[PDB]
Amino acid sequence: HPETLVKVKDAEDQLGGRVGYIELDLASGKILESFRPEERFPMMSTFKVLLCGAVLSRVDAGQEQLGRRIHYSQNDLVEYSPVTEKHLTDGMTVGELCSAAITMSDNTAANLLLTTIGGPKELTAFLHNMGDHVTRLDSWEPELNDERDTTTPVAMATTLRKLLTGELLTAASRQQLIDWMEADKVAGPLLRSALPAGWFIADKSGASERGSRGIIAALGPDGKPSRIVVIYMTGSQATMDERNRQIAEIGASLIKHW
Numbered sequence: 001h002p003e004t005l006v007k008v009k010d011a012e013d014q015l016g017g018r019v020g021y022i023e024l025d026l027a028s029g030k031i032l033e034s035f036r037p038e039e040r041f042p043m044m045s046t047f048k049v050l051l052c053g054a055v056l057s058r059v060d061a062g063q064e065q066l067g068r069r070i071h072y073s074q075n076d077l078v079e080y081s082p083v084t085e086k087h088l089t090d091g092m093t094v095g096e097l098c099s100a101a102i103t104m105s106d107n108t109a110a111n112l113l114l115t116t117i118g119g120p121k122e123l124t125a126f127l128h129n130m131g132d133h134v135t136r137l138d139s140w141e142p143e144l145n146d147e148r149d150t151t152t153p154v155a156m157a158t159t160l161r162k163l164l165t166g167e168l169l170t171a172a173s174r175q176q177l178i179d180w181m182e183a184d185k186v187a188g189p190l191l192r193s194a195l196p197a198g199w200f201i202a203d204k205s206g207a208s209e210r211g212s213r214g215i216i217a218a219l220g221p222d223g224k225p226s227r228i229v230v231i232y233m234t235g236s237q238a239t240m241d242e243r244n245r246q247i248a249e250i251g252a253s254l255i256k257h258w
């Protein structure tokens, strides 16, 4: 029920650390509201959407195929690999690896895909190549979680808008990317918990043990996304339950005032 910026500021007062938020109109790219839009936050698992943007850009360029099968071994597994640990014999295709990285936040899926492009610094080069000179990935999973592996709310939002609506990717690749974010399985306690019946939402969350939480999302009424929302929090000693609740309440405020 309070206006959104009031609720964001309240959330920060209750939690400590910092909360960064931006709401952007999808069609025009106008910023509708924001708080700490230019300050840095840890990306956490939200990078996995940017990583699969770089893989689909390779597919558009004829350098990669979503159906290409990758075989890997027990040695390649890192912490939190719920889908990849189940395919040691059959492997996964590049498309399945992106689905696992986005919809389950599978960490070995993200590492395998980072190998296909030459590592974290090459992801950062793809971002630079599209006009985002702020966002940087420096680490492999599971140890993203200083300025390493960070973005700002306005950099991430703008970059997500460029991937989803721009002509940087083909229409089929842009649709594949939003399809995987719409199928996200692990963000149910965040924005999803405040969405009314019939709205569209495509999202990717991030968390660290550890103090941090974030979500990036494209959402809108009547089955169509019309706004991008980015929320990042870092730096507090609050519990996971408390961080999830504040995000769901900021979500309720932006819907009630849409």
Ligand SMILES: [Ca+2]
Residues within 6 Å of the ligand: 009, 012, 013
């Ligand atoms: Ca404050």
